[PDB]
Amino acid sequence: HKVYVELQELVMDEKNQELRWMEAARWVQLEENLGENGAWGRPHLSHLTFWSLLELRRVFTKGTVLLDLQETSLAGVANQLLDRFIFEDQIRPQDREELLRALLLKHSHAGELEALGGVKPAVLTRSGDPSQPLLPQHSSLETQLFCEHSPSGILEKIPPDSEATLVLVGRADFLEQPVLGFVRLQEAAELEAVELPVPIRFLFVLLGPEAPHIDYTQLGRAAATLMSERVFRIDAYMAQSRGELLHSLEGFLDCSLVLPPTDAPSEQALLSLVPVQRELLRRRYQSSPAKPDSSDDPLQQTGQLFGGLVRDIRRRYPYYLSDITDAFSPQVLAAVIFIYFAALSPAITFGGLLGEKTRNQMGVSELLISTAVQGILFALLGAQPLLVVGFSGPLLVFEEAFFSFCETNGLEYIVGRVWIGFWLILLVVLVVAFEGSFLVRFISRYTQEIFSFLISLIFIYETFSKLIKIFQDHPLQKTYNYNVLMVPKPQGPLPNTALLSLVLMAGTFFFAMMLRKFKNSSYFPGKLRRVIGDFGVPISILIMVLVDFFIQDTYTQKLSVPDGFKVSNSSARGWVIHPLGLRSEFPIWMMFASALPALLVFILIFLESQITTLIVSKPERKMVKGSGFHLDLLLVVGMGGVAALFGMPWLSATTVRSVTHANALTVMGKAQIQEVKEQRISGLLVAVLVGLSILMEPILSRIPLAVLFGIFLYMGVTSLSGIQLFDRILLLFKPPKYHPDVPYVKRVKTWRMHLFTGIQIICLAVLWVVKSTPASLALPFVLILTVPLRRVLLPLIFRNVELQCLDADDAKAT
């Protein structure tokens, strides 16, 4: 069923001038080859070349065939085969005295070669001395690509009951034409050229002088791949004459498939050659008695209660050991170090803002604890462990509105949030029970692109706003006061703060851009180059932290965290909040009417998390393992409710942080996205670090705040890549002469794409204006109102083929 094939050629050693036999490749269902090192390349499929098969046919038409000869040694084989070449007049009788000693030479493997020093090709002459070939030589294709433990696996793959074949290829200048001998033994025989304990049954001899369009290594490869096929081997086991082998060879060539060189090769058009090879396979196995070996939606409405949750669990959880193991690369460590700061900074900002906004009812420590716990639990029990949970802006807006309402109506605040959380829990249980997440199907690429573009734009705008605020706090004046106390916060302007902050921001961005581009260059050895390129952000941060550390007298705002795990305002709050009443008892009508804000919070959280999961897990970003919707929603909302029980805030999935995490854990090919490392260790470590951040005061207190602005700008610029609306906006300026070769350029006219882009930009502008309007909480509704626009209004303006080509659901297929 499975056989072992060996190929040896007659070459010379670098040690001393001589001739001897050295193997070049091995065949057990696959090709394995070795280079100059003496190491065997990884097995691969064998690829033929035209001249090898053609000249094999030509020499095989006139080959002597000896069937079931009774020999067990090599010298009797040599004698009988050379008598056979004498018999059919394939070689002159005055050559035999050379060819015998041509055969009786040593046959050594790779392990002897390092003491030998290495080998190089040599040619037999009439004298018996090695010589260099006259026709020129070229570097081999298989050794360059594949070569530039194994024997235990060789003996593992080979069944214990098997027989082997050998081919002996060489060049000899004293011959006229190439000759071929093909001998099948009577019984299995052990031969002293093969160190492996397997016996030999078949044997090949391919000799000849040098001729154009003939490469004897390639001819040997053709012979070995001829011997490896199941049906031809069965025929040779049952062969009784030459014409049978001829007919089997013609059947071998008939079911072959040749592809020519082209102009611009691609993989997508090449995948359409699968079924014709299968039909050639079937037609090949049409002639054989033997038989060949090889011959769900994440969102879907199911007729069972709770179907989606069980489906996602059964789909995801079998990958847990791989999720654990895949974290041992250093790129995961770099991504952890990046996302730690990327998630810590906005946490601190929102904590300070919420503490100063709600009279310190909720502060920084609660937010930190919530981020830590809700990251740890989600990374341990989550279906998509590449999401990053954290506080957002609309949640802060809702907290503002609810605090204003509770200040006006005269009720407490931290108590009502408990009932809001209870209603959230009940609502998410009810929704998950009826698998109502299939509605995610209706959200097309339109809304996803609009949302992501708007989010990234707001990110960059807020970053620049922070910088302009810094410039506003310490203006550029001609004189300053210098008996100023800067203990609580910088009072009054300072000389060099405003410009040093800008310098640090530009420096971080510039260094990040210098390392991201060097990662893709070809300047250092590949290993060290990729290792240095994957750690770009931490290296730039460390360099600039040292640069700021060397400067002594200038003031720059630093990172500061609370002292210990304490509540924000210990006068009116506790670690646990009594639902009935903290200071005064809670009314009944509010208990029953708290359902109204819960629905809005649920809509916000659901929309954000599901759109984030849609953006993250598109088919284009080579995501192998499945991603779950119902499980993530249930986990997030239930845990948010349970955290709302303790008075700590609820969280949601973040867009920019998750996209940055996913982009950081991607190994790209020399560009094509080769693969993406999915694991659960990164999120868990990030959550643990965010939790322990309060114990890292001495190290964190030395990181200036202006360095992270460069990282934020870098993040905002990098997250802008995959957006397609951005590409269509860029095409608004180029003349139609330089437009790319994507389908939406060729299929539709230009001034229609421009109309589409204009409509989408108008939608963006309306969303922005509504965001600036004090009616900001009506932002999600308006967003979903873009979905009917795509279903009804656009087909009244455009045509169906334009709409299918422009608003394409898959990126690669359009």
Q: Which stretch binds a copy of itself (CB under 8 A): 40-48, 107-115, 411-419, 534-542?
A: 40-48
In angstroms, the CA 786 to CA 788 distance is 6
| Core vs surface per residue 712-727: b (16+ CB within 10 A) or e | bbbbbbbbbebbbbee
In angstroms, the CA 322 to CA 735 distance is 49
Phi, psi (rounded to 5 degrees) for 206: -120, 105
Q: Does 259 bind a copy of itself (CB under 8 A)?
A: yes
Q: Does 280 bind a copy of itself (CB under 8 A)?
A: yes
In angstroms, the CA 526 to CA 486 distance is 50
Q: Does 148 bind a copy of itself (CB under 8 A)?
A: no
Of residues 187 through 216, those in contact with a copy of itself by CB under 8 A are 213
Among residues 304 and 479, whose Cβ is nearest to a copy of itself?
A: 479
Least distance in angstroms from the C-beta of 478 to a copy of itself: 4
Q: Of 409, 387, 475, 466, which is closest to residue 680 (Cα–Cα)? A: 387
Contact 346, 391 (CB under 8 A): yes
Q: Of 58, 78, 6, 21, which is closest to residue 178 (Cα–Cα)? A: 58
Least distance in angstroms from the C-beta of 2 to a copy of itself: 12
Among 37, 150, 277, 560, binds a copy of itself (CB under 8 A): 277
Q: Of 505, 509, 531, which is closest to residue 519 (Cα–Cα)? A: 531
Among 87, 480, 549, 781, binds a copy of itself (CB under 8 A): 480
Among residues 215 and 400, whose Cβ is nearest to a copy of itself?
A: 215
Least distance in angstroms from the C-beta of 278 to a copy of itself: 6
Of residues 727 through 756, those in contact with a copy of itself by CB under 8 A are 733-735, 737-738
Least distance in angstroms from the C-beta of 738 to a copy of itself: 4
Q: Does 340 bind a copy of itself (CB under 8 A)?
A: no
Among residues 361 and 757, whose Cβ is nearest to a copy of itself?
A: 757
Least distance in angstroms from the C-beta of 764 to a copy of itself: 21
Least distance in angstroms from the C-beta of 532 to a copy of itself: 12
Contact 450, 766 (CB under 8 A): no
The continuous run of DSSP H or E covering 223 comes out as helix 216-228
Least distance in angstroms from the C-beta of 377 to a copy of itself: 39
Among 156, 553, 563, 741, binds a copy of itself (CB under 8 A): 553
Q: Does 547 bind a copy of itself (CB under 8 A)?
A: no
Site string for a copy of itself, 44-73 (x = CB under 8 A): xxxxxxxx-x--------------------
Q: Does 35 bind a copy of itself (CB under 8 A)?
A: no
Contact 680, 319 (CB under 8 A): no
Among 523, 576, 588, 774, binds a copy of itself (CB under 8 A): 523
SS3 672: strand
Least distance in angstroms from the C-beta of 111 to a copy of itself: 29
Among 76, 292, 318, 587, binds a copy of itself (CB under 8 A): 292
Residue 618 in tokens: 């598109």
In angstroms, the CA 654 to CA 268 distance is 34
Burial class (CB in 10 A: 0-12, 13-18, 19+), 213: exposed
Among 457, 506, 532, 770, binds a copy of itself (CB under 8 A): 506
Q: Does 499 bind a copy of itself (CB under 8 A)?
A: yes
Q: Does 284 bind a copy of itself (CB under 8 A)?
A: yes
Q: Does 275 bind a copy of itself (CB under 8 A)?
A: yes
Where does 551-593 have alpha helices with state H?
Answer: 588-593
Residue 143 region by backbone torsions, left for phi larger than 0, else alpha for psi between -120 and 50, else beta: alpha
Residue 94 in tokens: 């005055």
Q: Of 392, 401, 10, which is closest to residue 171 (Cα–Cα)? A: 10
Among 187, 254, 407, 620, binds a copy of itself (CB under 8 A): 254
Q: Which residues contact 629 (CB under 8 A, 6 or more apart)?
A: 298, 299, 308, 312, 437, 440, 610, 613
Of residues 756 through 775, those in contact with a copy of itself by CB under 8 A are none
Residue 411 in tokens: 């009720």
Among 16, 241, 408, 522, binds a copy of itself (CB under 8 A): 522
Among residues 111 and 275, whose Cβ is nearest to a copy of itself?
A: 275
SS3 36: coil
Residue with tokens 């705002």: 557
Among 238, 321, 476, 792, binds a copy of itself (CB under 8 A): 476
* 32, 183, 578 from 202: Cα distances, Å: 20, 6, 88
Q: Does 524 bind a copy of itself (CB under 8 A)?
A: yes
Among residues 685 and 753, whose Cβ is nearest to a copy of itself?
A: 753
In angstroms, the CA 393 to CA 779 distance is 12
Among residues 738 and 751, whose Cβ is nearest to a copy of itself?
A: 738
What count of other Cβ atoms lies within 10 Å of the Cβ of residue 185? Answer: 20
The continuous run of DSSP H or E covering 717 comes out as helix 707-718
Q: In residues, how long is the chain? A: 814
Q: Does 15 bind a copy of itself (CB under 8 A)?
A: no
Q: Does 36 bind a copy of itself (CB under 8 A)?
A: no
Among 136, 303, 526, 774, binds a copy of itself (CB under 8 A): 526
Least distance in angstroms from the C-beta of 631 to a copy of itself: 31
Among residues 291 and 583, whose Cβ is nearest to a copy of itself?
A: 291
Q: Which stretch binds a copy of itself (CB under 8 A): 159-167, 496-504, 617-625, 769-777?
A: 496-504
Among residues 93 and 740, whose Cβ is nearest to a copy of itself?
A: 740
Q: Does 257 bind a copy of itself (CB under 8 A)?
A: yes
In angstroms, the CA 338 to CA 659 distance is 13
Contact 633, 378 (CB under 8 A): no
Of residues 214 through 233, those in contact with a copy of itself by CB under 8 A are 225, 229-230
Q: How far is CA 406 from the centre of its chain?
A: 49
Least distance in angstroms from the C-beta of 502 to a copy of itself: 6
